[PDB]
């Protein structure tokens, strides 16, 4: 089917973007960190989105609530 | 927090927790070939960041 749609987050003075793409090796998630005039990103292949999500729950559960 | 790692194909992801005067942050580095990039996420948005990522995990198929 079509890919999930673009998403955005704002924190402090920077913006985060999430977009989905696909090539011959497959589907991936690009997470960009964009500031007024700086830009860097990471690229996560689909086959490890779950592994990623789990690491995050682990960090979120272990927060000083 | 502890700090973790993960391998996929030709890439390594590292998860490090750091701290400055303003508070705690999580830095996610990507290393492939011999290049590395990273994004850094302050604690105050870990939940929102988790949910957004989780929503993407909810859309996936087979
Ligand atoms: Cl998908």
Residue numbers in the entry:
A (entry chain B): 191 to 255
B (entry chain A): 194 to 213, 214A, 215 to 255
The paper states:
Pur-alpha is an ubiquitously expressed, multifunctional protein that binds to both DNA and RNA and is known to regulate replication, transcription, and translation. It has been shown that Pur-alpha binds to single- and double-stranded nucleic acids that contain GGN motifs. Nucleic acid-binding of Pur-alpha is mediated by three central PUR repeats, which are N-terminally flanked by unstructured, glycine-rich sequences and C-terminally by glutamine- and glutamate-rich regions.
To understand the role of the third repeat of Pur-alpha for DNA/RNA binding, we determined its crystal structure. The final structure model was obtained in the same way from selenomethionine-derivatized crystals at 2.6 Å resolution. Two molecules (one depicted in brown, the other in yellow) of repeat III form a dimer with intertwined α-helices, very similar to Pur-alpha repeat I-II. We therefore performed EMSA and observed that Pur-alpha repeat III bound with weaker affinities to CGG repeats and to MF0677 than Pur-alpha repeat I-II. Also in fluorescence-polarization experiments, PUR repeat III bound MF0677 ssDNA over 30-times weaker than PUR repeat I-II. However, in unwinding assays almost no activity was observed for PUR repeat III. These observations confirm that PUR repeats I-II mediate the main nucleic-acid-binding and unwinding activities and suggest that repeat III might predominantly mediate dimerization. Since in the crystal structure the C-terminal end of PUR repeat I-II is located on the opposite side of its nucleic-acid-binding surface (bottom), it is unlikely that PUR repeat III causes steric clashes interfering with the nucleic-acid binding by PUR repeat I-II.
